[PDB]
Structures are given as C-alpha cells and as structure tokens.
Design a protein around this ligand. Structure first.
Ligand SMILES: COc1ccc(C2=N[C@@H](c3cc(Br)ccc3F)[C@@H](c3ccc(Cl)cc3)N2C(=O)N2CCNC(=O)C2)c(OC(C)C)c1
Length: 89
C-alpha cells in the first residue's frame, strides 16, 4: 500500500497527467507513472527505445534535459533529488 513521499508541484502535475491524483506516490510509483507518461505522450524513439526524446515537453523542461538514456538517467535523478524529498531505490 501507499508509503511516505513528498514531490514538487510541476512534477506532481506529470503524475496526475500520467493517470494519478493527490501528491502521495513513492519513487517506485513515480518512475512507473513517468514510464506511462513517456509512452502516453510519445516522448521516445521507436528504434532507440532505451533513449527518451521529450524535445520540449513540460517533463523535459522541468528535468532540464530534452533527451536522456534509460541506462544513463543522470539528469533524471538530478531533477528527482531536487524535486522530491530524496526518495531512492
Ligand atoms: C531497452 O530499453 C528500455 C529498457 C527499460 C525501460 C523501462 N524501464 C523502467 C524503469 C527504468 C528506470 Br531507470 C527506473 C525505473 C523503471 F521502472 C521504465 C521507465 C520508467 C521511467 C523512465 Cl523516465 C524510464 C524508464 N521503462 C518503461 O517504461 N518501459 C519498459 C517496458 N516496456 C515499455 O514499453 C516501457 C524502457 O523504457 C523506455 C521505453 C521509456 C526502455
């Protein structure tokens, strides 16, 4: 069931838009919803599926990189540690 977390408002809005409600979802849920959002808004390449291509989406603007890798999520963790209250997995 639901456990302790606190996000940032422009990141919580990605979480509502990915299918959620409230602001209370742990890093496991946040990353699941980020995967749904990237697939739902189509922020990736069909051959470079390990690579995200948000190009100017509110998610890419908020994270501060408009492209990043699933095997090198460095700007994604950097945004999360500055948005969320430091949830890690
Ligand atoms: C070889 O390339 C891969 C491999 C794996 C994925 C992958 N792995 C997850 C994941 C990764 C991490 Br770091 C931490 C927690 C996770 F939960 C998650 C995801 C969620 C949010 C983000 Cl920001 C990025 C990726 N993620 C998916 O959303 N998937 C994998 C299964 N099938 C799908 O269609 C969608 C993949 O994803 C890209 C398409 C986005 C591509």
């Amino acid at each position: 069931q639901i456990n302790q977390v606190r996000p940032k408002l422009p990141l919580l809005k990605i979480l509502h838009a990915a299918g959620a409600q409230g602001e209370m979802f742990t890093v496991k849920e946040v990353m699941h919803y980020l995967g749904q959002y990237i697939m739902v808004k189509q922020l990736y390449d069909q051959q470079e599926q390990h690579m995200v291509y948000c190009g100017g989406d509110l998610l890419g603007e908020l994270l501060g990189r408009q492209s990043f890798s699933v095997k090198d999520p460095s700007p994604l963790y950097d945004m999360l540690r500055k948005n969320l209250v430091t949830l890690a997995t």
